mmCIF file of C-alpha atoms in Angstrom:
data_model
loop_
_atom_site.group_PDB
_atom_site.id
_atom_site.type_symbol
_atom_site.label_atom_id
_atom_site.label_comp_id
_atom_site.label_asym_id
_atom_site.label_seq_id
_atom_site.Cartn_x
_atom_site.Cartn_y
_atom_site.Cartn_z
ATOM 1 C CA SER A 1 -16.976 -6.902 -25.694
ATOM 2 C CA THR A 2 -15.577 -4.368 -23.244
ATOM 3 C CA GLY A 3 -16.823 -1.611 -20.962
ATOM 4 C CA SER A 4 -15.176 1.478 -19.452
ATOM 5 C CA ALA A 5 -16.730 3.789 -16.858
ATOM 6 C CA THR A 6 -15.438 6.673 -14.782
ATOM 7 C CA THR A 7 -15.733 6.365 -11.014
ATOM 8 C CA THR A 8 -15.909 9.531 -8.884
ATOM 9 C CA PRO A 9 -15.318 10.145 -5.154
ATOM 10 C CA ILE A 10 -18.527 11.019 -3.294
ATOM 11 C CA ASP A 11 -16.823 13.641 -1.131
ATOM 12 C CA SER A 12 -13.555 15.419 -0.381
ATOM 13 C CA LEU A 13 -12.242 12.478 1.673
ATOM 14 C CA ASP A 14 -12.752 9.705 -0.913
ATOM 15 C CA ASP A 15 -15.134 7.986 1.528
ATOM 16 C CA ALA A 16 -16.507 5.990 -1.413
ATOM 17 C CA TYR A 17 -16.689 6.088 -5.218
ATOM 18 C CA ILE A 18 -19.768 6.174 -7.462
ATOM 19 C CA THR A 19 -20.027 4.908 -11.035
ATOM 20 C CA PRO A 20 -22.987 5.594 -13.348
ATOM 21 C CA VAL A 21 -24.982 2.475 -14.319
ATOM 22 C CA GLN A 22 -27.791 2.254 -16.883
ATOM 23 C CA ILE A 23 -30.730 0.054 -15.804
ATOM 24 C CA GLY A 24 -33.821 -0.728 -17.843
ATOM 25 C CA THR A 25 -35.433 0.470 -21.053
ATOM 26 C CA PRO A 26 -35.408 3.404 -21.554
ATOM 27 C CA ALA A 27 -32.252 3.688 -19.462
ATOM 28 C CA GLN A 28 -32.502 4.810 -15.852
ATOM 29 C CA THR A 29 -29.054 5.972 -14.750
ATOM 30 C CA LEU A 30 -28.179 5.349 -11.105
ATOM 31 C CA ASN A 31 -24.848 6.047 -9.423
ATOM 32 C CA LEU A 32 -23.702 2.833 -7.770
ATOM 33 C CA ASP A 33 -20.918 1.942 -5.337
ATOM 34 C CA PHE A 34 -18.883 -0.795 -7.046
ATOM 35 C CA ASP A 35 -17.974 -3.213 -4.284
ATOM 36 C CA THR A 36 -15.436 -6.009 -4.769
ATOM 37 C CA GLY A 37 -16.284 -7.173 -1.227
ATOM 38 C CA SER A 38 -19.913 -8.147 -1.893
ATOM 39 C CA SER A 39 -21.994 -9.796 -4.588
ATOM 40 C CA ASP A 40 -25.421 -8.134 -4.725
ATOM 41 C CA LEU A 41 -26.487 -5.445 -7.219
ATOM 42 C CA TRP A 42 -29.143 -3.550 -5.267
ATOM 43 C CA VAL A 43 -30.782 -0.179 -5.809
ATOM 44 C CA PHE A 44 -32.949 2.394 -4.180
ATOM 45 C CA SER A 45 -36.280 2.013 -5.935
ATOM 46 C CA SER A 46 -39.928 2.977 -6.184
ATOM 47 C CA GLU A 47 -40.461 0.197 -3.610
ATOM 48 C CA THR A 48 -38.116 1.675 -0.978
ATOM 49 C CA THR A 49 -39.889 2.818 2.213
ATOM 50 C CA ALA A 50 -40.440 6.527 1.555
ATOM 51 C CA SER A 51 -39.039 7.699 4.916
ATOM 52 C CA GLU A 52 -35.793 5.890 4.060
ATOM 53 C CA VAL A 53 -35.194 7.776 0.790
ATOM 54 C CA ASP A 54 -33.453 11.151 1.110
ATOM 55 C CA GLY A 55 -32.154 12.479 -2.199
ATOM 56 C CA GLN A 56 -31.201 9.220 -3.943
ATOM 57 C CA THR A 57 -32.148 8.517 -7.548
ATOM 58 C CA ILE A 58 -34.511 5.548 -7.647
ATOM 59 C CA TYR A 59 -35.085 2.692 -10.072
ATOM 60 C CA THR A 60 -38.749 2.346 -11.062
ATOM 61 C CA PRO A 61 -39.236 -1.073 -12.651
ATOM 62 C CA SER A 62 -42.774 -0.267 -13.829
ATOM 63 C CA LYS A 63 -41.273 2.327 -16.201
ATOM 64 C CA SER A 64 -38.889 -0.208 -17.773
ATOM 65 C CA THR A 65 -40.208 -2.297 -20.648
ATOM 66 C CA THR A 66 -37.522 -4.936 -20.054
ATOM 67 C CA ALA A 67 -38.065 -5.329 -16.275
ATOM 68 C CA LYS A 68 -39.556 -8.594 -15.037
ATOM 69 C CA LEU A 69 -40.314 -9.570 -11.443
ATOM 70 C CA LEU A 70 -38.229 -12.552 -10.405
ATOM 71 C CA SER A 71 -41.164 -14.238 -8.758
ATOM 72 C CA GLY A 72 -40.648 -15.324 -5.161
ATOM 73 C CA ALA A 73 -37.097 -14.021 -4.879
ATOM 74 C CA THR A 74 -36.000 -11.940 -1.887
ATOM 75 C CA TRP A 75 -32.664 -10.639 -0.639
ATOM 76 C CA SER A 76 -31.201 -9.347 2.602
ATOM 77 C CA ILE A 77 -27.643 -8.234 3.245
ATOM 78 C CA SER A 78 -25.587 -6.947 6.166
ATOM 79 C CA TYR A 79 -22.234 -5.289 5.625
ATOM 80 C CA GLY A 80 -19.094 -5.112 7.743
ATOM 81 C CA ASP A 81 -19.842 -1.562 8.861
ATOM 82 C CA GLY A 82 -23.181 -2.666 10.313
ATOM 83 C CA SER A 83 -25.343 -1.272 7.528
ATOM 84 C CA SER A 84 -28.011 -3.353 5.790
ATOM 85 C CA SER A 85 -30.727 -3.493 3.155
ATOM 86 C CA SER A 86 -33.353 -5.913 1.837
ATOM 87 C CA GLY A 87 -36.110 -6.307 -0.721
ATOM 88 C CA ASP A 88 -37.311 -8.215 -3.781
ATOM 89 C CA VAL A 89 -35.781 -8.818 -7.222
ATOM 90 C CA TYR A 90 -36.307 -7.939 -10.869
ATOM 91 C CA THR A 91 -34.351 -8.971 -13.903
ATOM 92 C CA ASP A 92 -33.532 -6.170 -16.349
ATOM 93 C CA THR A 93 -30.917 -4.923 -18.805
ATOM 94 C CA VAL A 94 -27.893 -3.360 -17.087
ATOM 95 C CA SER A 95 -25.085 -1.494 -18.840
ATOM 96 C CA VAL A 96 -21.787 -0.224 -17.434
ATOM 97 C CA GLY A 97 -19.577 1.938 -19.601
ATOM 98 C CA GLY A 98 -21.037 0.540 -22.826
ATOM 99 C CA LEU A 99 -21.018 -3.110 -21.700
ATOM 100 C CA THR A 100 -24.529 -4.564 -21.581
ATOM 101 C CA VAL A 101 -25.904 -7.572 -19.676
ATOM 102 C CA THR A 102 -29.439 -8.757 -20.279
ATOM 103 C CA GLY A 103 -31.329 -10.621 -17.553
ATOM 104 C CA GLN A 104 -29.272 -9.148 -14.700
ATOM 105 C CA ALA A 105 -30.733 -9.562 -11.236
ATOM 106 C CA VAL A 106 -31.485 -6.054 -9.982
ATOM 107 C CA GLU A 107 -32.312 -6.235 -6.307
ATOM 108 C CA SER A 108 -34.907 -3.630 -5.408
ATOM 109 C CA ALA A 109 -34.666 -2.303 -1.851
ATOM 110 C CA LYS A 110 -37.788 -2.227 0.269
ATOM 111 C CA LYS A 111 -35.753 -1.290 3.342
ATOM 112 C CA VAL A 112 -32.351 0.318 3.880
ATOM 113 C CA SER A 113 -30.505 1.166 7.087
ATOM 114 C CA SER A 114 -29.835 4.729 8.189
ATOM 115 C CA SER A 115 -26.286 4.915 6.810
ATOM 116 C CA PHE A 116 -27.682 4.420 3.306
ATOM 117 C CA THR A 117 -30.568 6.885 3.717
ATOM 118 C CA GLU A 118 -28.157 9.504 5.031
ATOM 119 C CA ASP A 119 -25.850 9.186 2.018
ATOM 120 C CA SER A 120 -27.721 10.953 -0.790
ATOM 121 C CA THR A 121 -24.919 10.356 -3.299
ATOM 122 C CA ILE A 122 -25.096 6.525 -3.391
ATOM 123 C CA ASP A 123 -28.095 5.050 -5.236
ATOM 124 C CA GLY A 124 -27.121 1.426 -4.536
ATOM 125 C CA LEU A 125 -24.295 -1.087 -4.746
ATOM 126 C CA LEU A 126 -22.900 -3.225 -7.545
ATOM 127 C CA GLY A 127 -21.143 -6.250 -6.116
ATOM 128 C CA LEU A 128 -18.042 -7.643 -7.779
ATOM 129 C CA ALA A 129 -16.989 -10.382 -5.332
ATOM 130 C CA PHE A 130 -17.759 -14.019 -6.200
ATOM 131 C CA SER A 131 -21.367 -15.007 -6.876
ATOM 132 C CA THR A 132 -21.278 -17.570 -4.039
ATOM 133 C CA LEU A 133 -21.859 -14.589 -1.670
ATOM 134 C CA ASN A 134 -25.003 -13.383 -3.441
ATOM 135 C CA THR A 135 -27.901 -13.218 -0.961
ATOM 136 C CA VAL A 136 -30.889 -13.816 -3.257
ATOM 137 C CA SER A 137 -33.160 -16.615 -2.035
ATOM 138 C CA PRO A 138 -34.289 -19.214 -2.959
ATOM 139 C CA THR A 139 -32.325 -19.002 -6.212
ATOM 140 C CA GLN A 140 -28.900 -17.389 -5.844
ATOM 141 C CA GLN A 141 -28.075 -14.871 -8.586
ATOM 142 C CA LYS A 142 -24.924 -13.995 -10.500
ATOM 143 C CA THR A 143 -22.985 -10.730 -10.339
ATOM 144 C CA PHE A 144 -22.798 -8.338 -13.273
ATOM 145 C CA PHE A 145 -19.217 -9.479 -13.920
ATOM 146 C CA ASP A 146 -20.114 -13.157 -13.835
ATOM 147 C CA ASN A 147 -22.946 -12.592 -16.295
ATOM 148 C CA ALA A 148 -20.728 -10.500 -18.612
ATOM 149 C CA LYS A 149 -17.681 -12.745 -18.418
ATOM 150 C CA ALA A 150 -18.210 -15.054 -21.372
ATOM 151 C CA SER A 151 -18.828 -12.080 -23.676
ATOM 152 C CA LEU A 152 -15.767 -10.124 -22.547
ATOM 153 C CA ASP A 153 -12.631 -9.996 -24.689
ATOM 154 C CA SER A 154 -10.732 -11.159 -21.581
ATOM 155 C CA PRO A 155 -12.364 -12.358 -18.318
ATOM 156 C CA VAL A 156 -11.075 -9.468 -16.208
ATOM 157 C CA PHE A 157 -12.018 -6.137 -14.730
ATOM 158 C CA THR A 158 -9.683 -3.452 -13.420
ATOM 159 C CA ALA A 159 -9.972 -0.829 -10.692
ATOM 160 C CA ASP A 160 -8.039 2.400 -11.046
ATOM 161 C CA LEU A 161 -9.245 4.576 -8.178
ATOM 162 C CA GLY A 162 -8.109 8.169 -7.883
ATOM 163 C CA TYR A 163 -6.805 10.066 -4.880
ATOM 164 C CA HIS A 164 -9.125 13.073 -4.527
ATOM 165 C CA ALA A 165 -9.904 12.608 -8.242
ATOM 166 C CA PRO A 166 -11.934 10.450 -10.622
ATOM 167 C CA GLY A 167 -10.705 7.080 -11.791
ATOM 168 C CA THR A 168 -11.838 4.198 -13.952
ATOM 169 C CA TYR A 169 -13.383 0.721 -13.882
ATOM 170 C CA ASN A 170 -12.704 -1.259 -17.046
ATOM 171 C CA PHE A 171 -14.277 -4.566 -18.037
ATOM 172 C CA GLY A 172 -12.755 -7.020 -20.481
ATOM 173 C CA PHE A 173 -9.352 -5.433 -21.162
ATOM 174 C CA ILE A 174 -6.219 -4.171 -19.459
ATOM 175 C CA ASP A 175 -5.345 -0.551 -20.371
ATOM 176 C CA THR A 176 -1.557 -0.724 -20.682
ATOM 177 C CA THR A 177 -1.377 3.105 -20.644
ATOM 178 C CA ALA A 178 -2.932 3.293 -17.165
ATOM 179 C CA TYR A 179 0.034 2.057 -15.104
ATOM 180 C CA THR A 180 3.811 2.250 -14.875
ATOM 181 C CA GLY A 181 6.228 -0.666 -14.907
ATOM 182 C CA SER A 182 4.829 -4.198 -14.855
ATOM 183 C CA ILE A 183 1.794 -5.823 -13.258
ATOM 184 C CA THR A 184 2.620 -8.350 -10.544
ATOM 185 C CA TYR A 185 0.093 -11.148 -10.233
ATOM 186 C CA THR A 186 -0.611 -13.025 -7.015
ATOM 187 C CA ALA A 187 -2.787 -16.005 -6.062
ATOM 188 C CA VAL A 188 -6.407 -15.670 -4.946
ATOM 189 C CA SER A 189 -8.439 -17.882 -2.650
ATOM 190 C CA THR A 190 -12.179 -17.866 -3.327
ATOM 191 C CA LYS A 191 -12.988 -20.029 -0.291
ATOM 192 C CA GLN A 192 -14.695 -17.140 1.542
ATOM 193 C CA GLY A 193 -16.170 -15.623 -1.650
ATOM 194 C CA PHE A 194 -13.741 -12.679 -1.662
ATOM 195 C CA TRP A 195 -10.781 -11.560 -3.736
ATOM 196 C CA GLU A 196 -8.551 -12.884 -0.961
ATOM 197 C CA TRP A 197 -4.782 -12.809 -1.344
ATOM 198 C CA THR A 198 -1.575 -12.729 0.719
ATOM 199 C CA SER A 199 0.641 -9.681 0.862
ATOM 200 C CA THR A 200 4.332 -10.397 1.343
ATOM 201 C CA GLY A 201 4.922 -7.666 3.961
ATOM 202 C CA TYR A 202 5.182 -3.958 4.662
ATOM 203 C CA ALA A 203 7.321 -0.923 5.372
ATOM 204 C CA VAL A 204 6.631 2.322 7.225
ATOM 205 C CA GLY A 205 7.988 5.463 5.607
ATOM 206 C CA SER A 206 11.619 5.029 4.605
ATOM 207 C CA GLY A 207 12.011 2.099 7.002
ATOM 208 C CA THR A 208 13.174 -1.394 6.166
ATOM 209 C CA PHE A 209 10.725 -3.819 4.611
ATOM 210 C CA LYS A 210 9.344 -6.481 6.960
ATOM 211 C CA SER A 211 8.761 -9.784 5.191
ATOM 212 C CA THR A 212 5.606 -11.282 6.644
ATOM 213 C CA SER A 213 2.494 -12.884 5.151
ATOM 214 C CA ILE A 214 -0.680 -10.816 5.505
ATOM 215 C CA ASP A 215 -3.869 -12.496 4.258
ATOM 216 C CA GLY A 216 -6.588 -10.034 3.309
ATOM 217 C CA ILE A 217 -9.210 -9.025 0.749
ATOM 218 C CA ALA A 218 -9.124 -6.481 -2.064
ATOM 219 C CA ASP A 219 -12.287 -4.505 -1.250
ATOM 220 C CA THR A 220 -13.249 -1.417 -3.238
ATOM 221 C CA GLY A 221 -16.312 -0.951 -1.013
ATOM 222 C CA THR A 222 -14.285 -0.373 2.159
ATOM 223 C CA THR A 223 -12.788 3.104 2.628
ATOM 224 C CA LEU A 224 -9.769 2.355 4.806
ATOM 225 C CA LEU A 225 -6.878 -0.085 5.117
ATOM 226 C CA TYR A 226 -7.428 -2.569 7.966
ATOM 227 C CA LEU A 227 -4.384 -4.575 9.028
ATOM 228 C CA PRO A 228 -3.178 -6.566 12.054
ATOM 229 C CA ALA A 229 -2.705 -4.579 15.263
ATOM 230 C CA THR A 230 1.071 -5.193 15.215
ATOM 231 C CA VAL A 231 1.408 -3.580 11.779
ATOM 232 C CA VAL A 232 -0.894 -0.675 12.572
ATOM 233 C CA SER A 233 0.904 0.073 15.846
ATOM 234 C CA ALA A 234 4.241 0.096 14.004
ATOM 235 C CA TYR A 235 2.821 2.643 11.534
ATOM 236 C CA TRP A 236 1.288 5.042 14.066
ATOM 237 C CA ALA A 237 4.334 4.868 16.340
ATOM 238 C CA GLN A 238 6.086 6.971 13.673
ATOM 239 C CA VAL A 239 3.573 9.822 14.036
ATOM 240 C CA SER A 240 4.154 12.074 17.065
ATOM 241 C CA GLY A 241 1.012 12.310 19.168
ATOM 242 C CA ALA A 242 -0.891 9.526 17.396
ATOM 243 C CA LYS A 243 -2.981 7.254 19.607
ATOM 244 C CA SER A 244 -5.801 4.770 19.489
ATOM 245 C CA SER A 245 -8.984 6.311 20.865
ATOM 246 C CA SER A 246 -11.800 3.976 21.915
ATOM 247 C CA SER A 247 -14.179 6.960 22.078
ATOM 248 C CA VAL A 248 -13.487 7.923 18.468
ATOM 249 C CA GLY A 249 -13.195 4.336 17.240
ATOM 250 C CA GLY A 250 -9.589 3.998 16.090
ATOM 251 C CA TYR A 251 -6.277 5.734 15.613
ATOM 252 C CA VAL A 252 -6.265 9.503 15.568
ATOM 253 C CA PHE A 253 -3.367 11.878 15.041
ATOM 254 C CA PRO A 254 -2.600 15.582 15.317
ATOM 255 C CA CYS A 255 -3.847 17.408 12.233
ATOM 256 C CA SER A 256 -0.501 19.252 12.272
ATOM 257 C CA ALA A 257 1.397 16.021 11.496
ATOM 258 C CA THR A 258 3.105 15.012 8.295
ATOM 259 C CA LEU A 259 2.213 11.353 7.756
ATOM 260 C CA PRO A 260 4.760 8.774 6.549
ATOM 261 C CA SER A 261 4.048 6.563 3.557
ATOM 262 C CA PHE A 262 3.087 2.912 3.932
ATOM 263 C CA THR A 263 4.376 0.232 1.557
ATOM 264 C CA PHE A 264 2.781 -3.179 1.035
ATOM 265 C CA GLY A 265 4.248 -6.193 -0.753
ATOM 266 C CA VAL A 266 2.797 -7.986 -3.757
ATOM 267 C CA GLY A 267 5.146 -10.876 -4.394
ATOM 268 C CA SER A 268 8.562 -9.291 -4.918
ATOM 269 C CA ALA A 269 6.920 -5.983 -5.918
ATOM 270 C CA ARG A 270 6.043 -3.014 -3.694
ATOM 271 C CA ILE A 271 3.092 -0.608 -3.698
ATOM 272 C CA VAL A 272 3.664 2.716 -1.927
ATOM 273 C CA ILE A 273 0.736 4.522 -0.317
ATOM 274 C CA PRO A 274 1.723 8.190 0.111
ATOM 275 C CA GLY A 275 1.197 9.626 3.584
ATOM 276 C CA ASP A 276 -1.447 12.076 2.372
ATOM 277 C CA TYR A 277 -3.689 9.121 1.376
ATOM 278 C CA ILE A 278 -3.789 8.120 5.053
ATOM 279 C CA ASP A 279 -5.283 11.449 6.219
ATOM 280 C CA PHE A 280 -9.067 11.331 6.730
ATOM 281 C CA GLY A 281 -9.333 14.788 8.242
ATOM 282 C CA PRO A 282 -10.770 16.186 11.459
ATOM 283 C CA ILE A 283 -12.795 13.759 13.562
ATOM 284 C CA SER A 284 -15.457 16.478 13.806
ATOM 285 C CA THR A 285 -15.701 19.876 12.147
ATOM 286 C CA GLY A 286 -13.040 22.221 13.503
ATOM 287 C CA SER A 287 -11.195 19.570 15.527
ATOM 288 C CA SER A 288 -7.398 19.417 15.506
ATOM 289 C CA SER A 289 -7.575 15.627 15.956
ATOM 290 C CA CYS A 290 -7.558 13.839 12.597
ATOM 291 C CA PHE A 291 -8.724 10.313 11.750
ATOM 292 C CA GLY A 292 -6.245 7.761 10.429
ATOM 293 C CA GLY A 293 -6.627 5.842 7.188
ATOM 294 C CA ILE A 294 -4.834 2.746 8.483
ATOM 295 C CA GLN A 295 -6.741 0.986 11.262
ATOM 296 C CA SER A 296 -6.633 -2.308 13.131
ATOM 297 C CA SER A 297 -8.503 -5.302 11.738
ATOM 298 C CA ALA A 298 -8.606 -6.880 15.197
ATOM 299 C CA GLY A 299 -12.175 -7.967 15.792
ATOM 300 C CA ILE A 300 -13.187 -7.683 12.125
ATOM 301 C CA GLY A 301 -11.841 -11.167 11.596
ATOM 302 C CA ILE A 302 -10.214 -10.329 8.266
ATOM 303 C CA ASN A 303 -7.645 -7.874 6.930
ATOM 304 C CA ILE A 304 -9.041 -5.476 4.329
ATOM 305 C CA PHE A 305 -7.118 -3.772 1.523
ATOM 306 C CA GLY A 306 -9.709 -1.045 1.078
ATOM 307 C CA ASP A 307 -9.621 2.134 -1.013
ATOM 308 C CA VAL A 308 -6.648 3.652 0.854
ATOM 309 C CA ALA A 309 -4.490 0.817 -0.459
ATOM 310 C CA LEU A 310 -6.186 0.140 -3.782
ATOM 311 C CA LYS A 311 -6.116 3.774 -4.957
ATOM 312 C CA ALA A 312 -2.292 3.659 -4.826
ATOM 313 C CA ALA A 313 -2.348 0.958 -7.554
ATOM 314 C CA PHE A 314 -3.763 -0.199 -10.853
ATOM 315 C CA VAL A 315 -5.549 -3.408 -9.811
ATOM 316 C CA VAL A 316 -6.487 -6.321 -12.069
ATOM 317 C CA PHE A 317 -9.266 -8.648 -10.930
ATOM 318 C CA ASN A 318 -8.615 -11.672 -13.132
ATOM 319 C CA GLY A 319 -11.702 -13.892 -13.289
ATOM 320 C CA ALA A 320 -10.149 -16.682 -15.315
ATOM 321 C CA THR A 321 -10.895 -20.283 -14.281
ATOM 322 C CA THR A 322 -8.168 -19.883 -11.649
ATOM 323 C CA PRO A 323 -8.649 -16.293 -10.468
ATOM 324 C CA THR A 324 -5.703 -14.039 -9.644
ATOM 325 C CA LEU A 325 -5.082 -10.421 -8.626
ATOM 326 C CA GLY A 326 -2.619 -8.066 -10.293
ATOM 327 C CA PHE A 327 -1.087 -4.892 -8.902
ATOM 328 C CA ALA A 328 0.924 -2.204 -10.669
ATOM 329 C CA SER A 329 2.189 1.201 -9.607
ATOM 330 C CA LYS A 330 0.774 4.161 -11.534
#
């Protein structure tokens, strides 16, 4: 089997991407944030504290003939941006782009933090990291991908995120029309439960490539590119007037600037992030200070190849017995 679904930016900045997901019988379609950095499929629901729902579409398990309470199971998750959610668990039929999993754990939110309430466009998350990170207790649950894997034509999914435009998540096949050149594959460590890999270095603009190992995670649920302070300083030093602002919470730059590209290494291959991808716009409405899309990972504890980086590539998440990651230009 295979699946193919379009993923759409939630706003003009590509702050996140939503993908329609069918849950239950008859189908209830919710728009979920596919997140390769976590492993819970959770939804706003009929059980979510009413004051914490503001415009989201909810899952109502009582209206699904295939929903079953997973008795005794609870979940609770905290994300890197400080947001969180928690609740109980149902199993139900879940379909993505024509690919159907029966008996998927669908984690129903009883509580969500303010960041989630305030984002009316995201109805929940669908985690695509390794199932060892799943938070369901006392019986850990599998991700949608892990459940689908054995049925897939090939044990892979691909992320093809657009810049200010829709893109695609495919399951079970590699669309050879969706990228240019060849795909370069690189080793993955699953020791922390992430799609963790080592970039071979970077360049700023038309500058020379610096060969240096940068360990980080491929994370579709993180907006920006978070790299070591040395790398980030080297990038922003090429933008006149750019500075790190503790009050704003990272590097800012004059909105009048033209940003240089940023290149990252995948083995002997190179992925180029155009400068425009690094512009996240005014820090507040009408400001001439703009927020940077490359930020320091210092004090996160991990480097993160978030959407800024991933949207510059066609990315293969290979879930074979020995997982790997593939990157191609497009």
